[PDB]
Amino acid sequence: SRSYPCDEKKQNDSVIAECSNRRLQEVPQTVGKYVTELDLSDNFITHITNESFQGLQNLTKINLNHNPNVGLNITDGAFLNLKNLRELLLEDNQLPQIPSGLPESLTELSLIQNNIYNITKEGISRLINLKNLYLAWNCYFNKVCEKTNIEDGVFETLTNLELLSLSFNSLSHVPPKLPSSLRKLFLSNTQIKYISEEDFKGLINLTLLDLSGNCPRCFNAPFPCVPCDGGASINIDRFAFQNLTQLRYLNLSSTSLRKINAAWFKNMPHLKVLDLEFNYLVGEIASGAFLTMLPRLEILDLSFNYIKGSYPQHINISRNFSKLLSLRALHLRGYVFQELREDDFQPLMQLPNLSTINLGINFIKQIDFKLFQNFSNLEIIYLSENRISPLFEFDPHSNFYHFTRPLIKPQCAAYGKALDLSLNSIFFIGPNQFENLPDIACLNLSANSNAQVLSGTEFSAIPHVKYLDLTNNRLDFDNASALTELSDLEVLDLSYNSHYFRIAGVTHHLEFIQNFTNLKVLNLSHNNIYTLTDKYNLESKSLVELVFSGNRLDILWNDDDNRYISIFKGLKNLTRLDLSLNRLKHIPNEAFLNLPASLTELHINDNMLKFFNWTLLQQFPRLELLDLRGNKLLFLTDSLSDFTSSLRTLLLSHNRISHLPSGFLSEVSSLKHLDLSSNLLKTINKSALETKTTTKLSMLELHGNPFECTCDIGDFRRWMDEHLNVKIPRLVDVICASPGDQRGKSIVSLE
Amino acid sequence: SRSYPCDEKKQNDSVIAECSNRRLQEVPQTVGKYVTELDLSDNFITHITNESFQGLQNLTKINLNHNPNVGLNITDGAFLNLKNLRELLLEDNQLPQIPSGLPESLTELSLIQNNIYNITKEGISRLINLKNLYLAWNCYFNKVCEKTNIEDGVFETLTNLELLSLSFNSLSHVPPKLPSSLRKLFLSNTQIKYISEEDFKGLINLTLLDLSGNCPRCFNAPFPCVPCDGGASINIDRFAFQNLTQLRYLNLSSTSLRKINAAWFKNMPHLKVLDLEFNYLVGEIASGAFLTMLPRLEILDLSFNYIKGSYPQHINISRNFSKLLSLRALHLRGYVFQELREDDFQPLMQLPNLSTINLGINFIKQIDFKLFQNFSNLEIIYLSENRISPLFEFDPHSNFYHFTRPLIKPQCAAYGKALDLSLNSIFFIGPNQFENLPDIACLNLSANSNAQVLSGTEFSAIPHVKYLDLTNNRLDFDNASALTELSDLEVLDLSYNSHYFRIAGVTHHLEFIQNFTNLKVLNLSHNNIYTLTDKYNLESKSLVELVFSGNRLDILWNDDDNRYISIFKGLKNLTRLDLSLNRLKHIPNEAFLNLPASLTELHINDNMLKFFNWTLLQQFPRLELLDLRGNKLLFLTDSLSDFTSSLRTLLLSHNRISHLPSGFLSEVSSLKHLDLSSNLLKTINKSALETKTTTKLSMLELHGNPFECTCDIGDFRRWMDEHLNVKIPRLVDVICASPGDQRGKSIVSLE
Ligand SMILES: *[C@@H]1O[C@H](CO)[C@@H](O[C@@H]2O[C@H](CO)[C@@H](O[C@@H]3O[C@H](CO[C@H]4O[C@H](CO)[C@@H](O)[C@H](O)[C@@H]4O)[C@@H](O)[C@H](O[C@H]4O[C@H](CO)[C@@H](O)[C@H](O)[C@@H]4O)[C@@H]3O)[C@H](O)[C@H]2NC(C)=O)[C@H](O)[C@H]1NC(C)=O
Ligand SMILES: *[C@@H]1O[C@H](CO)[C@@H](O[C@@H]2O[C@H](CO)[C@@H](O[C@@H]3O[C@H](CO[C@H]4O[C@H](CO)[C@@H](O)[C@H](O)[C@@H]4O)[C@@H](O)[C@H](O[C@H]4O[C@H](CO)[C@@H](O)[C@H](O)[C@@H]4O)[C@@H]3O)[C@H](O)[C@H]2NC(C)=O)[C@H](O)[C@H]1NC(C)=O
Ligand SMILES: *[C@@H]1O[C@H](CO)[C@@H](O[C@@H]2O[C@H](CO)[C@@H](O[C@@H]3O[C@H](CO[C@H]4O[C@H](CO)[C@@H](O)[C@H](O)[C@@H]4O)[C@@H](O)[C@H](O[C@H]4O[C@H](CO)[C@@H](O)[C@H](O)[C@@H]4O)[C@@H]3O)[C@H](O)[C@H]2NC(C)=O)[C@H](O)[C@H]1NC(C)=O
Ligand SMILES: *[C@@H]1O[C@H](CO)[C@@H](O[C@@H]2O[C@H](CO)[C@@H](O[C@@H]3O[C@H](CO[C@H]4O[C@H](CO)[C@@H](O)[C@H](O)[C@@H]4O)[C@@H](O)[C@H](O[C@H]4O[C@H](CO)[C@@H](O)[C@H](O)[C@@H]4O)[C@@H]3O)[C@H](O)[C@H]2NC(C)=O)[C@H](O)[C@H]1NC(C)=O
Ligand SMILES: *[C@@H]1O[C@H](CO)[C@@H](O[C@@H]2O[C@H](CO)[C@@H](O[C@@H]3O[C@H](CO)[C@@H](O)[C@H](O)[C@@H]3O)[C@H](O)[C@H]2NC(C)=O)[C@H](O)[C@H]1NC(C)=O
Ligand SMILES: *[C@@H]1O[C@H](CO)[C@@H](O[C@@H]2O[C@H](CO)[C@@H](O[C@@H]3O[C@H](CO)[C@@H](O)[C@H](O)[C@@H]3O)[C@H](O)[C@H]2NC(C)=O)[C@H](O)[C@H]1NC(C)=O
Ligand SMILES: CCOCc1nc2c(N)nc3ccccc3c2n1CC(C)(C)O
Ligand SMILES: CCOCc1nc2c(N)nc3ccccc3c2n1CC(C)(C)O
Ligand SMILES: *[C@@H]1O[C@H](CO)[C@@H](O)[C@H](O)[C@H]1NC(C)=O
Ligand SMILES: *[C@@H]1O[C@H](CO)[C@@H](O)[C@H](O)[C@H]1NC(C)=O
Ligand SMILES: *[C@@H]1O[C@H](CO)[C@@H](O)[C@H](O)[C@H]1NC(C)=O
Ligand SMILES: *[C@@H]1O[C@H](CO)[C@@H](O)[C@H](O)[C@H]1NC(C)=O
Ligand SMILES: *[C@@H]1O[C@H](CO)[C@@H](O)[C@H](O)[C@H]1NC(C)=O
Ligand SMILES: *[C@@H]1O[C@H](CO)[C@@H](O)[C@H](O)[C@H]1NC(C)=O
Ligand SMILES: *[C@@H]1O[C@H](CO)[C@@H](O)[C@H](O)[C@H]1NC(C)=O
Ligand SMILES: *[C@@H]1O[C@H](CO)[C@@H](O)[C@H](O)[C@H]1NC(C)=O
Known about the structure:
The structure is a homodimer. Chain A is mostly beta strands. Chain A has a single domain (1-751), classed as Leucine-rich repeat, LRR (right-handed beta-alpha superhelix) (Alpha-Beta Horseshoe), CATH 3.80.10. Chain A has a 28-stranded mixed beta sheet. In chain A, α4 (589-593) links the parallel β31 (576-578) and β32 (601-603). Chains A and B meet through loops of A and loops of B. Residues 455, 479-481 of chain A line the site of one 2-acetamido-2-deoxy-beta-D-glucopyranose. The PDB classes it as immune system. The entry lists the keywords Leucine Rich Repeat, RNA, RNA Recognition, Receptor, Innate Immunity, RNA Binding, Secreted, Antivirus and Antitumor Drug Binding, immune system.
């Protein structure tokens, strides 16, 4: 009754087996008969037939992707016996052709990343229930492939299709006879030079059109890239877009566009996001008669339109930018200019809804920051990666021309207005630096190569910063009053400042941490801190989370030094502590007891520990999570239930533990989750996990243990069938060691 | 006849067994009877008796250090049976007392890092042949320990002792009745406040005296440090040093010295190295009547004498520095001043033999570099770690107050005069920066946070640099003429410049490498290079070694891109190639053949490789070393001898290989060294390593393989005894896997 090899979960009242990554040479027949969704993805299966999926009714979905992993042979009508399948995922299977005789029940089919160069009536036209069809990434780049032949009006018979992606195939022409029902159509990187009037003419329901990468701009492309003759523009008919009144999204990126016809937008009152990236638009950004046509546009991406070899003094913004009323975010990146002036952004200053200006990668030497205060709604000022001074490698399921991640880390932005100066040249903060800025909750100073001693006078122009990123500088903390002018400070990231800390002869002062009443999260990671000056303790009444990882506690806690024994005790509010990567061989008993007793979460993981005193857990009544992972530990206590009543989760994975003590799990009612994976365990005696009282443990991880496959594991196997509420994951990965006959075989298979 | 557990080598015609780190619970009786030196260090041995070392004549030396590893019990006169022992190393054994009844044959004894607080006539006085005696590091710091009692005139009876180290013990007084034969005597950190006239009075042969750490300067000490009352100076008698005419070395460091008596040096015409570190000497460096007493002093270390809280404009050097004629290196570090002026170093400019000035850690903002040209002999200018702008944790066997490593990397210094600007603020190189400098062969620019585009005009003031360290900056290579003004350039280190390289939208230009006729070693490591602009190939006719490690060849060599296929082919002189850490799953065949055919050494190690085409080795007739270590490789060819005649060394360690092919080792006469360690091998068939022709293989590493201990390994065990010229190391670490009975046991032990 324990599901194998498939792990089974419950989602939306429904039933889904996860068989992915299971090294399956063939499709299991042991699948739960109730299963709605079957994921075979990333396996070794080389064959599909009519016997494979039998006995299975409610399956609406099959993921066959990535088989076999590092030549999938499918029989005609192998999938026909199943009338309930909507979604079918065949991606990355090295398929020569579309599989013949697919069920007509298919709403959604994914052929992405295959060898199919021929789209035929036989493979498609008989599926009338097709909603979304993905053919993308079959013929592209320098791959050896045939130009894609698309049989006349093959999609003509699909009256229900709202999504079609042919992107990254060799087409050269938009296929004739496209169904009216089309909503989203992806034509990107199809090598199409010409868009006629009659191509999209009959689609009135299109909400999205992707023409990107046709007549590409190939200079400095990090992919094989072939431009149109002379590197000319795509030729788009004056009337090509006239009958799309419903279009929300238009991706024109990398089309080599020098000038844009404003009459393309005549019929599109609803245009929302316009992607103009990777063209030559500097002239159009200077004048831009096409802007007056976009009153509803929310997002506009003009990024990377730079003229080759040019490094102008100022950016030139058309006054017509005042005509985009609903604009929210504006991306200008790789425009490459020297100096941003107050009067250059004038057209943007009256835009009511524009919260985001992306200026990244412009090589800007200087800005007057009083212009950002003359805007209305700005929540995000993204200046990252500039010169500002003081005073398959491509995911077919992702956007090709930019990253889809947030500009600012959501944790930071949630506090308020955001200013990202990261990856710049400001190595020193002058008294006047931040003057005339808005009220800044979130400030990113990361990677500014800042060597200064912070005296507490630096941020006084913007005292209300909640979240401060100082990461990856070389910071000299010689002053006890540092950063104290920020009274409302909550999150502080000091990570990767190790420059001065690692020099012993200089002075280091951390005392500033006590002065913060609201301080909550503090990152002190990877600072290589082995020594401090006159003050050996970190003390805060507010602080909650402290990440001390990547420092030397092996030195601080050295047996011959009593000075740092209390180092964390002064943090009385602290529920979370990260001691990882400190090279700890052991923790002196006196130093462990001096840990804050408020801790609910403690990570000592990824150290060298050969010893752990479990009796010391008596002093931590609030501790729900203990992370011991990635150590040398040989030793487990049998008395643990006498040591802690509070422990929900215990992670022991990747240790040297060879033996489970008799009465280990007994009488501890708290422990839900136990990670024993990747240990030295040969067997489990009957008396290890037996608990006379009530056992709340719902998860046990045994994978990676050298199990003796003899009759001695009968006690444990029996224990497994006796409790089915304990989930052991990766049951194909719990693998018998000895005897040599049973080596490689799962423990769940035995006489 | 295969030595076990001890590995045996030959040094100085002699015979030494290495038993270290062998997890020995007891002292082996299997030791080769001829053995001169026996190293038991870092083992589990808990006992020593009279039966341990029997049958062994010529042993002159025994290393018992670090036993047991993580309570050594020695019987009275356990070592007496051996009349040939000179050296005895007992270090770090947690010894309560000196072992009683030690042989009188001992010239050298090391008790370092033990619990011995009592030095008695019974343990020592009967050994008259003692030459060097190390008692150091028994009672120190915050360790729980007893003040050291030294029985009256216990060393009085040792007439042959030239070396005594009591350092880091609690003494408070220099022991009375010291033998005349003393040459080197280490009293450091013994808590001695007073040096009387009669302490050292009777030692005329002393070449070395270490008084360091008595009355320590404890501000900002990274160890528990207790000063004398008021933090006063050590009190040294006017006449204390009068009878040492032979003293070469004097370590006074960390004695809290405000002023120095010049009459201490009255009788020392031979003084060579004087260590003054960690005192308050700023006044003495300003006047210093003691300098006129040191005509022969070669090294003078004044480092870390800074006045607390002081940041003066200029350093003040006494005119009396002109009076040290034989001075070679001068260390002034942590003097902490702002500005170095031409006229401040005037007293030093006429010193004929002074090649080295160590200015590190002074927080210097500016220097006029034309003063270094007014010296005579300077080979080393060490400016590292300053503010200059544009335009147990302690090793008992090491120096406690500084690092003993070279200032400049020897490879760099060997080229000529050296200038180390590393760890500074110069973020831009102006045209006039290096003007008025000497002729610089070796230049360290590391860690200057330099973002500039090097145009080839930058170094023209010092064109003759052979070795250039640009490591750990953020370098923008946008120019093809970069660095080309250096015609004689040999070694170039570009490591850790990854800042701009990882941005795809910008341009990257490596073309400058071809312009160098003498370029030999090039470090391009950890630059995260996945993309380049207009030039996809590295080309040099001279270049020999290229380290490409820490980049992305997984991206560059992606199957869908032909652009970078030839990337290294243009280097026609290259004998050494490092492809490590490139995340390579596989190398496309066309890309491997495009590797330089001149390669004698190739490292692909520490990648993800699941595949290697051995047939491609046919194209590398010069290749003596192939490094495949740290990969996923499952597959070994049986045909290798047909593939390469040139391969001396093959490193396969840490791979997934489960099987040795029949006829693997056969007919390849070239292979000396084979590393199979840490693989999946269960057994070795008789036909794997059998070679009908002449076999030159002298080294085979099998440790870490899950060996079946059944009778099936008889074929291999037999093969081992049949060839004794093949050295298998770590024979305690070649460990039987199955059956469970033999698990943990070395394969060399079987029925
Ligand atoms: C030209 O410009 C257009 C318009 O911006 C771009 O069109 C977008 O293309 C991307 C890439 O395909 C789309 O992003 C993906 O959307 C998939 C569909 O999600 C929809 O439905 C789900 C629920 O069913 C909703 O949650 C979601 O909001 C959408 O409504 C997602 O399945 C994808 O995510 C999956 O893959 C990614 C990457 O592996 C993972 O991160 C996810 O966890 C998940 O597994 C992905 O989000 C996007 O939907 C398109 N926009 C529109 C409006 O349709 C073109 O890409 C662009 N041209 C190019 C090539 O640059
Ligand atoms: C220096 O140190 C600080 C302090 O730790 C780090 O900042 C924290 O970083 C961790 C990431 O490592 C962040 O934790 C992550 O938070 C996400 C929270 O997302 C929000 O929105 C979701 C809904 O989408 C809500 O559910 C949630 O409540 C939040 O409001 C979580 O999504 C993440 O959890 C997921 O991953 C974790 C394991 O990582 C699993 O346990 C979860 O089940 C789930 O799979 C994770 O919690 C944390 O938010 C950061 N906090 C702060 C203050 O920023 C810095 O990143 C670190 N910097 C450096 C340089 O290392
Ligand atoms: C005050 O100042 C004095 C004078 O400078 C310092 O005295 C030096 O102390 C150090 C530390 O003990 C000595 O360094 C060590 O010397 C040992 C002896 O080497 C001699 O003999 C060998 C061959 O037998 C020669 O090769 C060598 O040149 C010497 O003639 C070495 O054995 C040590 O090296 C071993 O340990 C180190 C560290 O583990 C390893 O790096 C080595 O590989 C090796 O295993 C070490 O080199 C030094 O000899 C002393 N100088 C003199 C002139 O005797 C004091 O240390 C200083 N006071 C303090 C505490 O700061
Ligand atoms: C960027 O890349 C460059 C190029 O590789 C690196 O520079 C090389 O660094 C390696 C060290 O990793 C250096 O190689 C080492 O050289 C030592 C040579 O010492 C000299 O003197 C000895 C006598 O004392 C002579 O025998 C010798 O001929 C030399 O004249 C060797 O001692 C080292 O070998 C020892 O270690 C190696 C393994 O490391 C063993 O194989 C040996 O048997 C022995 O145990 C080693 O050879 C090399 O010298 C450097 N060359 C240059 C040009 O500097 C940079 O370090 C790297 N930088 C960064 C930032 O990573
Ligand atoms: C301040 O600015 C710096 C630099 O721009 C920001 O660092 C960047 O943060 C992003 C988001 O976390 C990182 O990208 C992510 O990396 C992880 C790990 O590989 C990956 O899982 C994610 O999918 C995403 O790719 C990025 O690594 C990092 N960049 C650098 C230079 O390290 C930082 O986030 C900013 N801080 C705040 C609070 O905004
Ligand atoms: C240029 O200046 C930099 C910075 O001072 C030098 O880097 C430093 O080099 C030394 C010598 O190699 C490194 O010390 C060594 O580290 C290794 C690895 O841990 C260790 O095995 C050695 O015993 C020694 O401790 C040191 O790591 C490194 N410092 C930094 C900041 O990384 C560099 O050597 C200089 N280049 C030249 C050519 O002089
Ligand atoms: C030789 C170093 O010992 C102390 C020290 N530590 C620092 C430090 N972390 N930062 C500094 C910044 C500017 C000037 C001096 C210092 C300094 N200093 C120098 C001094 C001004 C005496 O504190
Ligand atoms: C948007 C980036 O695309 C090209 C580029 N790459 C670089 C570069 N690696 N470095 C630069 C330094 C100063 C000014 C401009 C650039 C630059 N630029 C800008 C430009 C002047 C057009 O080359
Ligand atoms: C601005 O956005 C708000 C929603 O936050 C919306 O109510 C308002 O109508 C928008 N104004 C314009 C000009 O689009
Ligand atoms: C910190 O710096 C401020 C301003 O430079 C100064 O007033 C104060 O003395 C410093 N605090 C110290 C040294 O503890
Ligand atoms: C301790 O943390 C809690 C939870 O964040 C917070 O409410 C409280 O203010 C903190 N205590 C102090 C003294 O700030
Ligand atoms: C564990 O900690 C306790 C303190 O409660 C101490 O008595 C005991 O010695 C420690 N155990 C070990 C093995 O150090
Ligand atoms: C300087 O050093 C050389 C050896 O290189 C030596 O011959 C000469 O006598 C020394 N001069 C002085 C003043 O010590
Ligand atoms: C490199 O820089 C020099 C000086 O700035 C300039 O003369 C030359 O044009 C540049 N070379 C290029 C861009 O290839
Ligand atoms: C190739 O390397 C050798 C050995 O260092 C050197 O002698 C020769 O000059 C190099 N060849 C060229 C063309 O510089
Ligand atoms: C190995 O390389 C040779 C070229 O000599 C090629 O013919 C063969 O296909 C390659 N082997 C594999 C398994 O790719």
